[PDB]
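Give me the fold.
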Amino acid sequence: GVEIETISPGDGRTFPKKGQTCVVHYTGMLQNGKKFDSSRDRNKPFKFRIGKQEVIKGFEEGAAQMSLGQRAKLTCTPDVAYGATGHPGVIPPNATLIFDVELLNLE
């Protein structure tokens, strides 16, 4: 389940497609919890592409449902990312994740 609540401004039409490299200012937040990951810290805003399953499924479907300049707010279900397994020391099992995602991409 990918739920999008867009902070409005952008263009709403430049949609990310397969074979396109995109740049995302992400910041992870735990539900009823603190931060765990932030692209604001290292200031290298994580160049990546679409079509290789490099990211998790909850973040991947959130990438295609956005456009340039937009600011979304993800809500990742446990079963698509880590809920059965849990990322060791960083994500406990059966965890629901919140991401602050802004898409300022290229290509």
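The two ends are 27 Å apart (CA to CA).
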